[PDB]
Amino acid sequence: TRKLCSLDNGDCDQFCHEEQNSVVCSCARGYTLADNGKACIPTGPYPCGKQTLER
Amino acid sequence: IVGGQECKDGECPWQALLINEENEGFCGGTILSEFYILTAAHCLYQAKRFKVRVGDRNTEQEEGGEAVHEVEVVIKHNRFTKETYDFDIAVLRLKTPITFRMNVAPACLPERDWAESTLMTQKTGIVSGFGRTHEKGRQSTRLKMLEVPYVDRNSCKLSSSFIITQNMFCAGYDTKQEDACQGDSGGPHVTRFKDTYFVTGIVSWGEGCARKGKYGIYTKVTAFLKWIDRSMKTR
Numbered sequence: 136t137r138k139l140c141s142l143d144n145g146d147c148d149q150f151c152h153e154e155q156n157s158v159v160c161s162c163a164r165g166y167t168l169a170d171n172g173k174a175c176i177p178t179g180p181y182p183c184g185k186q187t188l189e190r
Numbered sequence: 191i192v193g194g195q196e197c198k199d200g201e202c203p204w205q206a207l208l209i210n211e212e213n214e215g216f217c218g219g220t221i222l223s224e225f226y227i228l229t230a231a232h233c234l235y236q237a238k239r240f241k242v243r244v245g246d247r248n249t250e251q252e253e254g255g256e257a258v259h260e261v262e263v264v265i266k267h268n269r270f271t272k273e274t275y276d277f278d279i280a281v282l283r284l285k286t287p288i289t290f291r292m293n294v295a296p297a298c299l300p301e302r303d304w305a306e307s308t309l310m311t312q313k314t315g316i317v318s319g320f321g322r323t324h325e326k327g328r329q330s331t332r333l334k335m336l337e338v339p340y341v342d343r344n345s346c347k348l349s350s351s352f353i354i355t356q357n358m359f360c361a362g363y364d365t366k367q368e369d370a371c372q373g374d375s376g377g378p379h380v381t382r383f384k385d386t387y388f389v390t391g392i393v394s395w396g397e398g399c400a401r402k403g404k405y406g407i408y409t410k411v412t413a414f415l416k417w418i419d420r421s422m423k424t425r
């Protein structure tokens with residue numbers, strides 16, 4: 136079975152690009168690509184796109 | 191916003207409100223970073239001089255969470271024209287940086303291709319603002335949000351009495367009485383993806399509000415990502 140960004144966003148948290156024929160995940164500013172190369176880790180307490188909820 | 195719901199604490203933190211000399215809101219905006227606000231080019235005519243208020247949810251009673259910011263630079267798309275309302279977009283650079291906190295945070299700017307294939311294809315987006323809650327009425331004192339379905343361009347053009355350019359997109363309901371309205375202009379249209387909200391549109395115009403057989407028209411953010419990035423670097 137072969138498929139990339141079209142398959143569940145390539146398992147990427149955010150941006151998904153297909154380079155060489157492989158999935159390459161990336162993140163918006165304020166986030167760092169996690170070690171698993173898929174998740175986006177916030178660099179601060181108020182990363183973009185996150186609701187500021189508490190309860 | 192006609193219909194929809196009230197933005198509860200922290201639910202719409204990227205919402206900005208453009209306020210006139212009398213400190214009254216007349217248009218919305220979207221926080222993009224500590225120094226930049228995204229809004230509609232046409233909103234710049236609703237006031238000679240204006241400031242930006244963030245963190246507000248209820249224009250009535252000031253609760254200390256609000257913050258007012260002066261505008262240092264106004265960057266209006268040179269191609270905007272009231273004749274067609276095409277290129278209805280502008281970026282504002284504030285004189286002082288926004289302090290992110292409860293109810294104050296930027297919405298993410300997506301990448302063009304990904305946004306078009308992953309965001310624009312979602313079933314719905316969310317629009318918010320302090321605009322009118324009825325085609326005929328006063329501006330809402332409370333910030334509201336509304337889930338709006340993306341409308342395929344075909345239905346969009348057929349339903350519209352005016353030209354829908356490729357810089358615009360339709361969202362909303364055919365008959366259901368929910369839609370953005372006067373006053374929401376310049377405000378955020380965001381799309382959620384894996385718990386992260388990305389700016390996908392700018393409330394632009396519409397034929398009335400929540401009118402049957404009509405939809406809300408938005409500036410397509412993906413069509414101006416390069417322009418936006420360019421504007422956020424002095425140019």
Ligand SMILES: CCOC(=O)CO/N=C(/c1ccccn1)C1(c2ccc3c(c2)nc(CNc2ccc(C(=N)N)cc2)n3C)CC1
Binds near residue numbers: 373400
């Ligand atoms: C207030 C300006 O009105 C005019 O200039 C004359 O109407 N001309 C047009 C028009 C649209 C596209 C191309 C050419 N001409 C219009 C029009 C144009 C711009 C408009 C407008 C209505 N109403 C607004 C006020 N804001 C607004 C209203 C309803 C909205 C909605 N339903 N989602 C979202 C935003 N703005 C801002 C009738 C549909």
Ligand SMILES: [Ca+2]
Binds near residue numbers: 247249
């Ligand atoms: Ca308040």
